[PDB]
């Protein structure tokens, strides 16, 4: 299913996210998993693309939880 597709890609993305955000990795990975599979495969191939997506999700999350 698409859900297991995302979950499987999440399994590869999570440790890369956790290496820079060990506390928020679960939440940041889940946010990123909204993206389509082709984009997720791109993030797994390009560490600087994943990093920028992590930073974006960080800023979206902070705005959500602050103001």
């Amino acid at each position: 299913s698409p859900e297991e597709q995302k979950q499987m890609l999440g399994e590869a993305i999570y440790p890369k996210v956790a290496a820079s955000q060990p506390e928020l990795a679960g939440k940041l990975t889940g946010m990123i998993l909204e993206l389509p599979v082709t984009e997720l495969l791109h993030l797994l191939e390009e560490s600087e693309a994943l990093d920028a997506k992590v930073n974006e999700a960080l800023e979206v999350l902070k705005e959500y939880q602050q103001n």
């Binding site: 999440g10 946010m31 939880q65």
Partner: peptide, 15 residues
């Protein structure tokens, strides 16, 4: 953004 702060926390599986 396209990212939602309402997204589910990702949980890894284990054996």
């Amino acid at each position: 953004s396209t990212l939602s702060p309402n997204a589910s926390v990702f949980k890894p599986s284990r054996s």
